[PDB]
Symmetry: D2
Subunit: 215 residues, 4 copies
């Protein structure tokens, strides 16, 4: 059972201040596209909404020859969990844990996001991020139940210089990934993200494309 709709709940804190957000979306699991609308609960954000982009659904991502491991684990209900760290060039750090429940073609996401060390005068706390650069993630399978994923991420700023980060995650599966997934390493994923936000809501879209080669 592959997804068509999803809900999001982010909870946690930024620089010691609790925050919470809910959203709902749609996507196309055959084309790795998704979109989400989220209404900011109680007034504006005290930080750049662009910082939320990674935390705003790999179940929408197909692989070249068949289901992604993410899709397979939804389809058989065994599931996976995501444990992510992001280290920002100015010393800030975000840690995140993602858990999912499924009903038919509907995903429910419960995302714990904790951010600290954002400089009060930095681009995140002063809302100077203007967009997130397209990215390539590299995935390896150190064992049959664990994916290690790495990316070098970056945002454009109003200043003109890019705000960089290193993103690392483990994806841990309750059951082993299928042979035909494991035999194709490394696996890369190209992602494009678009965020438009106003005072009291945001609209998010992501396109993802898995590839082993470009030549």
């Amino acid at each position: 059972p592959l997804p068509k709709t999803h809900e999001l709940h982010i909870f946690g804190s930024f620089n010691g201040v609790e925050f919470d957000m809910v959203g709902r979306g749609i996507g196309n699991p055959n084309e790795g596209s998704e979109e989400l609308n989220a209404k900011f609960t109680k007034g504006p954000l005290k930080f750049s909404p662009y910082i939320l982009v990674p935390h705003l659904y790999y179940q929408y991502l197909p692989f070249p020859d068949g289901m992604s491991p993410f899709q397979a684990a939804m389809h058989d209900g065994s599931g996976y969990q995501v444990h992510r760290t992001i280290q920002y060039e100015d010393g800030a750090s975000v840690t995140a844990h993602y858990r999912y429940t499924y009903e038919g073609s509907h995903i429910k996401g419960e995302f714990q996001v904790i951010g600290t060390g954002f400089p009060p005068d930095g681009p995140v706390m002063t809302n100077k991020l203007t967009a997130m650069d397209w990215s390539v993630t590299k995935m390896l399978y150190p064992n049959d139940k664990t994916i290690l994923s790495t990316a070098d991420c970056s945002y454009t700023t109003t200043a003109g210089k890019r705000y960089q980060s290193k993103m690392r995650e483990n994806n841990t599966f309750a059951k082993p990934m299928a042979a035909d997934i494991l035999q194709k390493q490394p696996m890369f994923v190209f992602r494009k993200s678009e965020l438009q936000h106003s005072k009291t809501e945001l609209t998010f879209k992501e396109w993802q494309k898995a590839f082993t080669d470009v030549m």
Copy 2:
């Protein structure tokens, strides 16, 4: 009030498997010592108990000329939160968030600890860790409510090759730290740990000593 006793609740998961642990302890805040006993809330652990050492109370740490910022925040109840990431040389990662409540001289710790990507054949999952090397943490105060602390950590193993990690954390304070704290940077902290564990319990001791100089 300075602390004299504490209790510990750790909850989270390692390699996707929930675990939970409680214990009780004592310490001397004039001398930066502590002692903790804990039982496992389910038979033996499925990983080296030595991996828990950083998660097993900086309120017991004084500074050279007065209270640590940790002590001052316990004393006036305004408090601090710890956000820690540990990256292990074999690709495992741990993220942690520490929160505290105070009842006079008593500390209640609620510690979320999430570990992923420990190789099933690695020294953590096959219990080859023998002890935690003595360590030096470097602390800087990038602003008046934030400490950034870093350390290069290592364990001895049965094979005799060290198991290394990099530890990084923010400590985020509700109230600005005192000017006299903010004046002395970098501040270093020496730590020694000992862990004795058996099948169904562990005993933990830590000594901590702040210093700006050794000459």
Copy 3:
């Protein structure tokens, strides 16, 4: 002109033991292909020849809409230098500096390569590396004379487990890169490498392809 032939001189040390290698080769600057043969002056190497892969010619890399900055800089003779760091998961490190001279369509490379801390019983020093995984490099242009390039690299080994590294470099240009090159960021590059080696010598090939998108 665009390059058609090249020679290689690598000098430096691995774990404090000097080594030196010369080699010659050809490539197709319109397709991003190159190959190289090098005889060992003093018989089979003291470490895995696979470790040399990144050090065995971006002048053969075209860009999607015309010349790469590398090709342009060769064209006007103004040139560029590469300064590269590679950090291996077992604590080893390599630093490298590449300088080039040009005689028409022939490239002469002088590469200093210094490696240290490769454990004697590790996969490099005991020749357990079997191949270098295909890679994706992310390139940004923090200023008009500088590229910053990052890749997460990995080799296959005999014992099945991957041998990972992080590769970071600057490419520094004597004259600014063209505004047309500077406009399209990030720029990714896909690389495939092939190495075969005898007791006597080695043969190396590389295919590189630049892309801003896969969709």
Copy 4:
């Protein structure tokens, strides 16, 4: 023999522009002190003289119970080489290789230093560094000929924020280090630095102190 005098030759480049320095100094190998006078070869530095601090003689460093391995390698003439990498918070990097010859108690150092990616508007290239913070280096001995040393380094700057770096090195010994040295790990080294500079020259002092404990 222990050292009492040294000369220095740094050669290399910063942001692809060659520089060269020669200098002369003295020190006390029983107390871990040194001083150096050094001259800028042509005109002033295009960059902060403070960036040079780590490149401006562990032979002066005694150990708590006897000679450091650095001093023992000098004494018997077998020697060691230093291979150092430094990663700066704004994306810059320096690699250095130190080689030494000895004539009795006189050291001759030949230091290759290569720096790239320092932003033209950053604190190095616009001369905003004001001092190098006191530092603690952690040393481990993964094998009997190899030290791994790590330190988190920081400078004060004119803009009211620190400029941080991560320094990593291997020190590689032509002869095995002594077992009395190999048995005590980790070993830490505390270092203090002072720098003064004019248009034509600088004066540098360092104090180093090895310690296994502070309690």
